[PDB]
Ligand SMILES: [Cl-]
Ligand SMILES: [Cl-]
Ligand SMILES: [Cl-]
Ligand SMILES: [Cl-]
Ligand SMILES: [Cl-]
């Protein structure tokens with residue numbers, strides 16, 4: 001499922017992500033934009049052999065099980081395929097664990113490089129929320 005911008009903002013808010021660990025909703029929408037272009041089915045292999053999954057490109061090295069990432073963990077206790085659903089519940093719950101891990105949203109390299117310090121409120125501007 002390819003979300004619209006305001007549609008995804010609303011779904012993220014309904015699942016408790018707005019201001020989670022102090023990160024406003026626009027930060028989360030911005031990260032989703034540049035990780036997946038709002039596509040829940042996005043996957044992207046990494047050089048180390050892990051794979052990133054879903055709207056927030058959650059990585060199999062630490063966070064989900066895909067059966068082909070040697071030496072990895074599954075700290076969200078989910079199959080990585082759950083992160084591709086049209087229902088974003090699994091991605092949101094796992095992102096809450098990731099953003100709590102110590103470095104905040106810097107865990108998402110694209111958030112640091114393309115969202116951090118910018119006018120992230122633009123990503124929710126105009127939305128009925
Ligand atoms: Cl957009
Ligand atoms: Cl917010
Ligand atoms: Cl915002
Ligand atoms: Cl594995
Ligand atoms: Cl584990």
Ligand SMILES: [Cl-]
Pocket residue numbers: 065066078079080
């Ligand atoms: Cl599994």
Ligand SMILES: [Cl-]
Pocket residue numbers: 011086087088089
């Ligand atoms: Cl949803």
Ligand SMILES: [Cl-]
Pocket residue numbers: 021022103104105
């Ligand atoms: Cl933080």
Ligand code: NA
Pocket residue numbers: 060061062063064065066069072073074
């Ligand atoms: Na894994």
